[PDB]
Structure formats: structure tokens, C-alpha cells
Structure 1
Amino acid sequence: YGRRIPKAEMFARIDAVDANAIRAVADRFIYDQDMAVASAGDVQFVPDYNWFRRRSYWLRY
């Protein structure tokens, strides 16, 4: 950050987050976006990319 954030400012920043802000941030970062999927081990039954990609959005809404 180039500085040392005081704990009062970190608390004030955390205290400013409400449900609307969480909804907007999740709408910006998650909804109908590409993702990266990594796996290891016994992964023969892990779904492929199109299965993961279709479940980033809801057609019901």
C-alpha cells in the first residue's frame, strides 16, 4: 500500500460494507464470468469447463 493503514481506517472501511455492496461486488466479479478450474488426483468424475461455465448464471431470473 505504500503506507501503514491505521486500525481505525480499516475498521471504518469494514464497517461501511452492507448487503448492497456485497451484492454489487459479487455481481461485478462472479456473475456470468469465466473462471479457472484446477484439479488433482482421482479427478475422472470432475465436470469439464462447460459444466462449470454454465453455472455462473441463472436462467430462472
Structure 2
Amino acid sequence: IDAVDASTIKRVANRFIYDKDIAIAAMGPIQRLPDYNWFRRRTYWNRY
């Protein structure tokens, strides 16, 4: 556990999170929840 430092976090985050596909399931009054292209685009930051 303590062999996981700040550099280990970024390397596993780039393997699993950064610019990857997602899966969504929603239920209820969900007409104001954003759509799939809104969510897929925000898996990366076009600013850094």
C-alpha cells in the first residue's frame, strides 16, 4: 500500500482513465443529464 506514491497514481490513471471509453446507466427524471459525447470528451483535458 505504501509503495503507491504520487507518481504511481498518475501512471495507473493514464492506463485506466485517460482517454478511455465509459459505460453509463441512468434512471428517473434524467432529461437534464448530459449525453454520451459530452461524457466521452471530458476524459481528457484540452488545456495542458
- The interval holding the TM-score normalised by the smaller chain is over 0.9
**Number of residues paired by the alignment?**
48
Structure having the larger proportion of residues in helix: 1
Query: Structure 2: where are the runs of 5+ without partners?
Result: none
Task: Confirm or deny that 1:54 pairs with 2:44.
Answer: no
- CA RMSD after TM alignment: 0.7
Structure 1 stretches of 4+ with a deviation exceeding 4 A read: none
TM (norm. structure 2) is 0.92
Give the equivalent residue in structure 2 for 1:11. none
Q: Larger RCO: Structure 1 or Structure 2 (Cα < 8 Å, ≥ 6 residues apart)? A: 2
TM (norm. structure 1) is 0.74
Mapped to 2, the partners of 1:38 and 1:48 lie a distance apart of 12
Question: Identical aligned pairs, as a percentage?
Answer: 67
SS of 1:15's equivalent in the other structure is coil
Give the equivalent residue in structure 2 for 1:37. 24
Query: Structure 1: where are the runs of 5+ without partners?
Result: 1-13
